[PDB]
Design a protein around this ligand. Structure first.
Ligand SMILES: [Cl-]
Ligand SMILES: [Cl-]
Lengths: 931, 931
């Protein structure tokens, strides 16, 4: 078995240099790949392993020199496989890619930082190896901006970072597989400890093999396209994995960094520096599977998960809190609680005596947590309970009061150090996570609210709210929100959809306010859209209404957005209802689908500028919600610069960002990764509030305004004006098969306009072409270079000195690293009509030209010249993804064309749809985020 | 704050050299003491801290040169303290000693072993730094003894180490403090990791301080001398601490060591290599607090703790067991289980589908475990349930059957590696721990069984079983055991004691046999005692009777023991009840109270010789149960040689040892210490079975017979013949205050004959005198040296070549290391009449002579010359213990003599019985095990 000598050689050719001297990435993936191929040989034979290894070697050679012969050599093997071998090979390359991902995460997590590699400017903040940690950000604010530590501390107290967990656009990886990946990363990391004994190392090797086999031997296709409740369960796994333990550890490090600049206080335990929100079970935009019952279910499930975690954590807390000296107030509470009926600690104590007063109070808290868990479970599984609401915690203050009593009491007696231990961690967990872990946002199209109001006005013989102008809509809505008479009853003709909308509001009214965040209006365009939701909320008897958040998607909607928000703030009722706070959402992917990516980027910078101007005019604290597709939605270090790049005063101590599902494992799967994620969000938010990016030079604004026009021209001329573009899109890409398959929901929700943004990005990401991300950049840069010889220099100045522009281009460059026009050409050759071949050829030429122009702008000769660690890891993954690409292409030809007969090969040792699904899930997991 | 500089110097003067180069003990204790004294100053003022540190400095100066002036310097300070300051000082020195122990444990756990320090003989097996680990034991058996790997493996399959956890003779440390000590050890160890970052180190220092203060600020008195259920709760904590996770790790290491000699199998997962037993709630010998209800309680509590641990452990198992390929048998069971009513994993899955068959079966197991816990809880708190017994696991086979089914199926599909992971660990935990974690032994005096049978026979108008000769007793008992008529009914005059005995039997009958171990007869002398218990068992309707175990205590009882066991094996009924297995218990401490320690040692070697001869005669497998006080009851390396020293064939793959409460923390408190404990018990049992110690030369046996005669003469002439000895014992020692206080139970079952062994040893251990351990050795060695010039050379030969003798002497040497005649003389000066002073002076001279003679025998100039690490650790503790000694002496004088007025000092910043209790608990924790 000298086969190992070959994969090592190929791996070393793929990743040649060393990005440091703790660079063990090739070692890691070589070990995992060797062990996997041995498992594969033992289960499916020697021939199967040899076939698979020949394929991988060819793929890696291709990612080296991109010789098209290597692609033809891959295809020759992949077409000759009967569906059984096709399934085994596809599964095999999926798991091989997963192992490359795990090795990459370990390498990232244990890479030593380099203080001497910092250049001293903001470019350092684009990579994890040079970004500023918490304390370096503190000292940068103290030295360069001459801010006093007390100002830094006061900024932190009132700062909030709000991370929003959304469903994965594909395989929301099951909780069990997350755990297996964790065990693999742990075995890997421990195997390279520079002190380990022979027997420990042998047992770790055997544990690693055992786990890799375990992951390879579980099916990941059948049953259902998981119900929204299941997807929510899988999405909540990261709280148990890292986030629950991670929040108090991070906050304590904030305390230590504050001590290292002279601050003696800690960050107050009730200060919400970190918050979590969820769309899982709340986003109904084009998703009929998300019903009123789904929302009720995930709300109660979240209350259960939280009560479970508090219940298990408070037993350790009860063992630690064995003091007897206490406050007079706490002693009074101990005597009161002792007069009652001790069922959840008989294994610990027969009963808690009054000479352990902290244990008395905490034991009663444990009892209330148990009743809350069992009660929410009874509500979920039936619809009623029998658990008195007074025996549980219904709001966060009931929970915090006795814990704070313990903290005050402990501090009274000089036991502050004891109080700053498990008790401080607990208080910070209650403040961060509340009774729900997450707050659920609800999202719905504006048109659905319009349908509801139209049925209402038609039922009252007043006209159709739909035909009314925006001004008449506003006038009627305003008369109703200010009036004293209810609007509608059961005697109302309701369609199925209208009943969905109203029932969602009724379920919101029947659940605790701690469970909900924002009501987000998709396709928001006018103030009447927001006022419709405020009115529907009020008339559905929602006592504590949700905050309404418009999502301005199309480009024209963004241009009209500050006008609409100003008109909203100018209405007296809405002004006094919002209580000085407004949240607006922007969708980078959504706007890019409308007008190309470069135009959407520059338009979103300008739109935030004007919205801040409005908020200052009316004295409102604005919160910008960054949807998916942004620079701030990337994985790792880049986010740090992206946050710093936002326009001045757009954050103001309140950051709300979508954590994309294709990135959540890279960000929260591992202990170190979790800490560093929380750290860069916190540090960048704090720094941006006190140190905005430079204001753009006037010529930069004018130049980008010009480029936006040319870029929208090219993008729309190809996507919307070319008649046969849609025909090509249906051939060169698995868009049709993606919706028809099983993943997500509905993609339409006519033409591309009705197509959702996620399938729009996905379809082209599968083919390694990425047209939605880069299209438009080429013609814009060509146009400005040709108009004036000097514009190139100006572009090169912007990329070097304007953070916004650098992050925009940097994201484009990263997407180009994951692109390969040769593979896209293979899709054309197999799946596209001949008379459409020049069309794709032209698009590929555009791909090439933009690439060179993007390089010229960034001052680079190769892609990602400034981030070799990412270039290295991407090359590693691409070697596995390429095989799944060729396999997916030929599998598509086999599905669509039963007249394409292939010379089959004999089956290799112990359904084309399953193959296709495997390749989609795999390629998606290897490319992760693009646009 | 340069106070740290003086204590560093004093520690370095106390422990001068370095016992290695990873010797960080002085550093460790300096760190712990600095942090503690800072906490003490912060809580109780600067004056209190200065007073305490002056005391410690004087104590270390004393342990340096033993100048008696230092003791008067301590006493002048300690008598002038009013009871409040007295309590604070005593508490402080107790916690300082605890911190010294924790540092010593960390040093032991992280001390690197030395391969080049092995000498190649059995002496290496007397210290943890040189003892043979598992694999070294294997190669010792394979190379030197010519045993085949198959033979070693077959021995391991059938080997059992049965460790019996007994109640602490003093403070059974509460579970909370065990956890706190764990955190202190963890912070200590992590602070010295040769890679730690500045912020991690800062936060670790703060966690260390936080924990030391937390432990110091909890009261450890009031309430009750904890109920036996509470003491049992505290005693079981080590399962959560280390043993539960620790057992499968060790067993897996046994598998690895087997692979390194060619064995390809694993130790069968159902093989009971490790077993745990408990006396907590079962020993009634002179302890009326242990009632039938107490035994029932700890039985149900144990079943609960076990069900909880299995329940929590099986969820991660359910996440790992996501395979789909399975057995025909398993697939059948999965389809069967799928037909039923999923309440304990909605947070995980809505329901378990049939395409995850292992999860189906395991989920049903998790459900049955939940019902087992809640049912045991309902019986404990009420007396009945309503949970059908068929919905739970009642015996170990019901539990193992589905788990083994999963293992077989996984192996069927080539998934054995997956099976040897969490599933193998789980199976090994079920086999080791059963449904109870521990099996409870029941212990009672034989005389109580005589009382029950006497009330029975008198009630039957047949005579008094008590007046009957032993032979008449045997004949009647045999006629009843072989007959069919029952013995008695409700119509039976029962005294409180007789009803206690019968009620205990009734509780045993109504509980699962898996909860119980052995029925132990204290003060056993004749076969009728065992037959009495067997008959009472049967007639109280115990369906599965316990195995009866006689405890032969007095020396004459030991001489008659092999005859009595032979007579038992010769009776057909008993021979058919025991099914080829018999367990006999011997009490090293118990026998020593009767006839001195040297005589009890030689008598126990001979008695084990003869018991083995009988067992081979009648074809019975003998198990020797070692009670408290033995060489095999020591801490650490000594146990390895102690086990290897037992007479040939006395173990035979079945070791049963009392884990004394004064050692259980040193043995199972930490992860590494736990593994090494389990390893040395396993390795020494295995080696002893295949490589018995040398048979003693005839002159060795003759010499020990003579020494035993002289030693028993001296011991009885001092302890039992001296008329004024009892008065001296009541004056020079805190024996009266110990029984009167609160600890344990009753110390007198009159004179010393009725005094129990535990208070006998404790009283003299408190004064650093240890007379019960060494008395008699002096005259025994003096006699033989004078009788023949060459006998010294013979003694030195035995110590060098006879393991039994070396371990016997080694224990004495270790006890002398914990002795200090100067402190004992201080007790004499304060508490003993003037005319009794020469008596104590003479005993102290005996102490000195015996010490010199033991040194001569061991070939040593100083004590513990061969184990410098232990000498160092004991010398470290002695500096703290000495202060509690002086404090205890003056406190005793103040309690007994209110005519002793002292010039008190003003109270120092922010009830003498409490102080006395503090000093007793402290000295007890610092001297740990002696005899
Ligand atoms: Cl559900
Ligand atoms: Cl109880």
């Amino acid at each position: 078995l000298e086969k190992m000598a070959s994969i090592d050689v190929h791996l070393r050719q793929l990743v040649p240099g060393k990005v440091s001297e703790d660079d063990k990435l090739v070692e890691y993936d070589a070990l995992l790949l060797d062990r996997f191929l041995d498992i594969l040989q033992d289960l499916h034979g020697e021939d199967l392993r040899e076939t698979v290894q020949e394929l991988y070697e060819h793929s890696a050679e291709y990612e080296g020199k991109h010789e098209p012969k290597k692609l033809e050599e891959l295809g020759s093997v992949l077409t000759s496989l009967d569906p059984g071998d096709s399934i085994v090979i596809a599964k095999a390359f999926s798991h091989m890619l997963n192992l490359a991902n795990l090795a990459e995460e370990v390498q990232i997590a244990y890479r030593r930082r380099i203080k001497k590699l910092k250049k001293g400017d903001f470019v350092d903040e684009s990579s994890a190896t040079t970004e500023s940690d918490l304390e370096e950000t503190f000292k940068k604010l103290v030295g360069d901006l001459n801010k006093s530590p007390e100002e830094i501390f006061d900024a932190l107290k009132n700062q909030t970072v709000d991370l929003v967990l959304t469903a994965h656009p594909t395989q929301s990886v099951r909780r069990s597989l997350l755990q297996k990946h964790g065990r693999i990363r742990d075995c890997l990391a421990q195997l390279y400890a520079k002190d380990i004994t022979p027997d420990d190392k042998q047992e770790l090797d055997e544990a690693l093999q055992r786990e890799i086999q375990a992951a390879f031997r579980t099916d990941e296709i059948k049953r259902t396209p998981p119900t929204p409740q299941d997807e929510m369960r899988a999405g909540m796994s990261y709280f148990h994995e890292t986030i629950w333990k991670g929040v108090p550890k991070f906050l304590r490090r904030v305390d230590t960094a504050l001590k290292n600049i002279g601050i003696e206080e800690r960050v107050p335990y009730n200060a919400p520096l970190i918050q979590f929100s969820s769309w899982m079970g709340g986003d109904r935009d084009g998703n009929p599977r998300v019903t009123p019952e789904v929302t009720r279910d995930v709300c109660l499930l979240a209350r259960m998960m939280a009560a479970t975690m508090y219940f298990n954590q408070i037993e350790d807390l009860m063992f630690e809190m064995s003091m007897w000296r206490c406050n007079d107030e706490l002693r009074a509470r101990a005597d009161e609680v002792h007069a009652n009926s001790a069922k959840h600690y008989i294994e610990f104590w027969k009963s808690i005596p009054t000479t352990e007063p902290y244990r008395v109070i905490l034991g009663d808290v444990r009892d209330k947590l148990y009743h809350t868990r069992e009660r929410a479970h009874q509500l979920l599984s039936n619809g009623h309970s029998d658990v008195p609401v007074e025996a549980t915690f219904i709001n966060l203050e009931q929970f915090l009061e006795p814990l704070e009593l313990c903290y005050r009491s402990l501090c009274s007696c000089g036991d502050r150090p004891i109080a700053d231990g498990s008790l401080l961690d607990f208080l910070r967990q209650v403040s961060t996570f509340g009774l729900s872990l997450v707050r659920l946002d609800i999202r719905q199209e504006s048109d659905r609210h319009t349908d509801v109001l139209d049925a209402i006005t038609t039922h009252l013989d007043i006209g159709s709210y739909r035909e009314w102008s925006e001004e008449r809509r506003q006038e009627w809505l305003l008369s109703e929100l200010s009036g004293k008479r209810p609007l509608f009853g059961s005697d109302l003709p309701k369609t199925e959809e209208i009943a969905d909308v109203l029932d969602t509001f009724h379920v919101i009214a029947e659940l605790p306010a701690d469970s909900f965040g924002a009501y987000i209006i998709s396709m928001a365009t006018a103030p009447s859209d927001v006022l419709a939701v405020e009115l529907l909320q009020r008339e559905c008897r929602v006592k504590q209404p949700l905050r309404v958040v418009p999502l301005f998607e199309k480009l024209a909607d963004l241009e009209a957005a500050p006008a609409a928000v100003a008109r909203l703030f100018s209405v007296d009722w809405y002004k006094n209802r919002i209580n000085g706070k407004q949240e607006v959402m922007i969708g980078y992917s959504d706007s890019g689908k409308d007008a190309g990516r470069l135009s959407a980027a520059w338009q979103l910078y300008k739109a935030q500028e004007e919205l801040v101007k409005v908020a200052k005019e009316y004295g409102v604290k604005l919160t910008m919600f960054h949807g998916r597709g942004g620079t701030v939605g990337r994985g790792g270090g880049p986010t740090h610069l992206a946050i710093l790049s936002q326009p001045p005063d757009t954050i103001n101590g309140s950051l709300r960002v979508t954590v994309q599902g294709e990135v959540i494992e890279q960000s929260f799967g591992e202990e170190h990764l979790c800490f560093r994620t929380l750290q860069r969000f916190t540090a960048a938010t704090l720094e941006h509030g006190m140190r905005p990016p430079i204001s753009p030079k006037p010529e930069w604004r004018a130049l980008l305004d010009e480029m936006a026009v040319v870029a929208t021209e090219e993008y729309r001329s190809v996507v919307f004006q070319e008649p046969r573009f849609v025909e090509y899109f249906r051939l060169a890409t698995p868009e049709l098969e993606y919706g028809r398959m099983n993943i997500g929901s509905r993609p339409s929700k006519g033409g591309i306009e009705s197509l959702r943004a996620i399938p729009w990005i996905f379809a082209w990401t599968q083919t390694r072409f990425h047209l939605p991300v880069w299209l438009g950049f080429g013609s814009a840069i060509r146009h400005v270079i040709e108009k004036d010889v000097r514009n190139l220099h100006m572009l090169q100045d912007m990329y070097q000195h304007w953070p916004f522009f650098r992050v925009t281009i940097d994201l484009i460059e990263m997407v180009f690293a994951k692109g390969d026009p040769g593979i896209a050409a293979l899709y054309d050759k197999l799946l596209v009509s001949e008379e459409l071949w020049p069309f794709g050829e032209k698009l590929r030429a555009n791909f090439e030209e933009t690439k060179k122009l993007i390089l010229q702008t960034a001052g680079h000769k190769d892609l990602l010249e400034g981030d070799p660690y990412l270039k290295q890891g991407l090359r590693l993954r691409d070697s596995y993804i390429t095989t799944l690409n060729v396999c997916q292409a030929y599998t598509l030809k086999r599905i669509r064309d039963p007249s394409y007969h292939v010379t089959l090969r004999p089956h290799i040792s112990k359904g084309l749809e399953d193959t296709l699904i495997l390749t989609m899930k795999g390629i998606a997991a290897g490319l992760q985020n693009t646009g």
